[PDB]
Amino acid sequence: SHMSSVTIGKCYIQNRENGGRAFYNLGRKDLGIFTGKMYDDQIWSFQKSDTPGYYTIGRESKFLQYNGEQVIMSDIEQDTTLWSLEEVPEDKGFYRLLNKVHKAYLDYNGGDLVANKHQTESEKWILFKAY
Amino acid sequence: TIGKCYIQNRENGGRAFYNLGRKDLGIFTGKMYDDQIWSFQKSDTPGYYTIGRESKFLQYNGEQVIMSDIEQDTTLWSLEEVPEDKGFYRLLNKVHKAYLDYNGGDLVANKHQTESEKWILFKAY
Ligand SMILES: CC(=O)N[C@H]1[C@H](O[C@@H]2[C@H](O)[C@@H](O)[C@H](O[C@H]3[C@H](O)[C@@H](O)[C@H](O)O[C@@H]3CO)O[C@@H]2CO)O[C@H](CO)[C@H](O)[C@@H]1O[C@@H]1O[C@H](CO)[C@H](O)[C@H](O)[C@H]1O
Numbered sequence: 147s148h149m150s151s152v153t154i155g156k157c158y159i160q161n162r163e164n165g166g167r168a169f170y171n172l173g174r175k176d177l178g179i180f181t182g183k184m185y186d187d188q189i190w191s192f193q194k195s196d197t198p199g200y201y202t203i204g205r206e207s208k209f210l211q212y213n214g215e216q217v218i219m220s221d222i223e224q225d226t227t228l229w230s231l232e233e234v235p236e237d238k239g240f241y242r243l244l245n246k247v248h249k250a251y252l253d254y255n256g257g258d259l260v261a262n263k264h265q266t267e268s269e270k271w272i273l274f275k276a277y
Numbered sequence: 278t279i280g281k282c283y284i285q286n287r288e289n290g291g292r293a294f295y296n297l298g299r300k301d302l303g304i305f306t307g308k309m310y311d312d313q314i315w316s317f318q319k320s321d322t323p324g325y326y327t328i329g330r331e332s333k334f335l336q337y338n339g340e341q342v343i344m345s346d347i348e349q350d351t352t353l354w355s356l357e358e359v360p361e362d363k364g365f366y367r368l369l370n371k372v373h374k375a376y377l378d379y380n381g382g383d384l385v386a387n388k389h390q391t392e393s394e395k396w397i398l399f400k401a402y
């Protein structure tokens with residue numbers, strides 16, 4: 147309990163397969179991926195968690211979470227907000243983001259963020275410095 | 278900021294690319310193909326940078342944005358910070374004082390400052 151994390155940097159989280167960026171808009175309660183204009187709500191806090199080798203992904207004082215059913219934003223840092231970076235051997239600079247609890251990779255379907263246990267081509271992300 | 282990078286436009290998320298086999302220079306929305314990885318290097322002229330792909334250098338000839346086989350004066354670009362958008366720069370051609378811009382799938386240049394000229398250059402790997 148009482149997990150903590152420390153912000154490492156601010157970054158965009160962009161998909162290799164469609165160039166789309168993960169975003170979270172608090173006012174619309176909207177979490178998704180968008181492929182056009184770059185907006186401020188596509189900037190995330192990348193955080194070293196208190197658990198070795200695992201990171202959290204934050205926006206608007208919340209944390210990116212996979213609960214076994216959907217990808218959502220959590221008000222509290224839970225074990226299900228821990229992600230590891232799995233380098234993609236064939237695509238230097240890209241990572242899969244693997245949920246610790248559920249061993250599911252961050253993916254997308256249409257405009258939605260999802261998670262998948264099988265490795266696929268739309269699970270490859272580049273997390274680049276926003277500033 | 279130096280070395281291999283992607284060069285991505287704020288307004289539409291498109292990335293500059295150059296494909297030697299197709300002789301195709303432009304901007305592209307969609308998948309992040311390897312012909313979108315540029316070499317951003319300090320030039321021989323202090324204060325300016327070259328934007329390199331396929332062993333060639335991005336230039337503006339006064340009419341069109343094209344590649345150059347050699348590092349000539351028209352291949353020199355400066356980074357001009359965008360005051361209102363942290364992390365973004367305009368790319369200003371030294372010889373012609375024209376900013377790198379886009380129109381559809383074309384790279385173009387414009388001496389006016391506009392909203393289509395804001396780029397983020399991020400590390401490729
Ligand atoms: C006004 C708005 O919601 N803009 C969002 C932006 O929305 C994009 C896109 O602009 C919009 O056209 C699209 O709408 C789709 C619609 O939802 C579907 O029902 C329909 O079938 O198809 C439409 C076209 O696809 O939704 C998109 C998002 O899915 O999304 C970006 C994402 O970065 C922003 O969230 C933007 O909102 C602005 O964000 C600002 C962030 O600094 C600020 O909070 C603005 O106030 C806010 O309007």
Ligand SMILES: CC(=O)N[C@H]1[C@H](O[C@@H]2[C@H](O)[C@@H](O)[C@H](O[C@H]3[C@H](O)[C@@H](O)[C@H](O)O[C@@H]3CO)O[C@@H]2CO)O[C@H](CO)[C@H](O)[C@@H]1O[C@@H]1O[C@H](CO)[C@H](O)[C@H](O)[C@H]1O
Pocket residue numbers: 294296301303305310311312313382
């Ligand atoms: C199939 C192809 O050439 N894909 C390119 C991609 O091309 C884009 C766009 O997808 C394509 O529809 C467009 O085609 C235009 C055509 O070139 C014109 O001659 C025609 O008159 O009008 C067409 C419609 O506009 O060209 C676009 C580029 O100008 O562009 C991307 C840029 O990153 C790639 O180059 C992609 O080809 C891929 O390149 C990879 C290497 O980077 C790899 O070799 C892939 O196998 C290859 O498919």
